Amino acid sequence: IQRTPKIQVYSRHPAENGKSNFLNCYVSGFHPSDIEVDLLKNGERIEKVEHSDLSFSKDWSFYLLYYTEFTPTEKDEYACRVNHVTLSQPKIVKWDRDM
Amino acid sequence: HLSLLYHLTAVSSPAPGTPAFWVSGWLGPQQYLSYNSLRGEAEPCGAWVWENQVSWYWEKETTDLRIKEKLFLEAFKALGGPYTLQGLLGCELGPDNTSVPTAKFALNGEEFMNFDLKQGTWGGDWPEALAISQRWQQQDKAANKELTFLLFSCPHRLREHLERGRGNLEWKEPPSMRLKARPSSPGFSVLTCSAFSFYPPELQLRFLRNGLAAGTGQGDFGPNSDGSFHASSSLTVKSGDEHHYCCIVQHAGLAQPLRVEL
Numbered sequence: 001i002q003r004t005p006k007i008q009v010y011s012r013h014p015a016e017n018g019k020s021n022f023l024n025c026y027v028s029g030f031h032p033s034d035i036e037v038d039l040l041k042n043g044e045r046i047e048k049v050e051h052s053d054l055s056f057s058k059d060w061s062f063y064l065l066y067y068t069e070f071t072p073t074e075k076d077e078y079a080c081r082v083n084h085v086t087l088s089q090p091k092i093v094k095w096d097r098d099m
Numbered sequence: 100h101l102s103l104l105y106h107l108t109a110v111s112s113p114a115p116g117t118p119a120f121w122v123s124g125w126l127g128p129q130q131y132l133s134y135n136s137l138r139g140e141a142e143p144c145g146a147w148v149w150e151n152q153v154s155w156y157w158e159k160e161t162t163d164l165r166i167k168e169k170l171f172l173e174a175f176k177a178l179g180g181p182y183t184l185q186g187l188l189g190c191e192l193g194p195d196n197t198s199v200p201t202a203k204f205a206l207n208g209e210e211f212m213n214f215d216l217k218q219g220t221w222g223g224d225w226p227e228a229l230a231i232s233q234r235w236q237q238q239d240k241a242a243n244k245e246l247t248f249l250l251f252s253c254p255h256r257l258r259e260h261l262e263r264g265r266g267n268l269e270w271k272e273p274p275s276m277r278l279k280a281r282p283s284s285p286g287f288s289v290l291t292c293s294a295f296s297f298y299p300p301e302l303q304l305r306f307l308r309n310g311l312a313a314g315t316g317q318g319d320f321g322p323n324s325d326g327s328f329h330a331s332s333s334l335t336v337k338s339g340d341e342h343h344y345c346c347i348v349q350h351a352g353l354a355q356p357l358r359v360e361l
């Protein structure tokens with residue numbers, strides 16, 4: 001079967017402009033395991049991005065964590081862009097600093 | 100009530116540069132082990148790197164997972180793809196200090212097979228489960244090795260980790276909390292209570308309005324790269340009414356529930 005990913009974007013610590021932090025894109029609940037994930041800074045792909053192993057939950061759906069070191073500012077916008085066979089087009093989820 | 104659980108995955112057509120077979124090993128909510136068929140070595144993860152384990156520990160994990168790698172890849176030849184085969188194998192110390200095994204498998208994301216420790220056999224209703232089971236049952240010593248892995252090796256390892264890495268599991272990191280409102284559709288705002296960088300993962304978020312229960316909100320939960328966790332809950336409220344709400348968090352790191360204001 002196929003399961004479409006759930007996408008969550010959040011920082012590791014509460015965001016403070018000018019303070020170094022990590023931005024996370026957590027993708028979960030998907031099947032099959034092949035998936036493409038980019039982090040974006042004002043729409044531009046971020047190059048220095050790390051990720052976890054691909055794991056899976058009790059219902060057999062996969063999950064994995066993408067993360068990058070960043071320093072938030074007032075004006076910079078970040079997003080996570082995900083492609084998967086269940087998606088008609090890449091899905092882009094914006095980082096909401098409150099989440 | 101701590102589980103040691105291996106998450107095994109094999110794929111029949113791995114993308115180039117990615118492994119046909121990989122494993123993550125978990126102690127409760129913590130990943131302690133990584134393995135993939137390209138590197139061919141089991142490795143510790145995170146704080147478990149500094150666990151001062153017995154000399155042969157990681158060589159034995161590597162030995163067992165190389166055997167399971169061969170078994171998983173043989174399963175595809177038994178099937179009539181592409182295919183994904185997953186297994187959840189491990190144990191938990193239950194009441195009365197005995198080990199309780201888990202041995203379940205999924206094909207293309209559907210549970211379809213298990214290992215019956217009483218008969219020493221893999222089984223399931225689907226013809227694909229019969230086929231893979233027969234192929235594994237026919238390989239010499241495979242059922243025996245699976246029995247030893249579940250009844251002896253897994254509880255032994257779990258006990259070795261409770262003896263040398265129990266500190267990792269006693270980590271208590273209380274959450275850093277934020278409660279913020281943002282405008283939404285006309286006449287409404289969204290209130291979000293967020294909990295950052297906490298451990299253990301069990302956490303409850305609740306909203307009150309003028310001290311009265313206002314619901315749990317719609318919650319999300321996820322990890323950070325160090326194995327701590329993140330959570331948030333969001334509630335739609337009428338705009339201008341945001342300041343009558345607060346959020347309450349309960350977490351094992353906090354002796355009492357903590358009230359969070361805007």
Ligand SMILES: CC(=O)c1c(C)nc2ncnn2c1-c1cccc(F)c1
Binds near residue numbers: 052063064322324
């Ligand atoms: C690297 C990383 O993100 C990481 C590590 C090292 N240990 C962990 N323990 C519990 N979560 N957790 C995370 C993780 C592991 C796999 C998938 C995932 F989405 C997150």
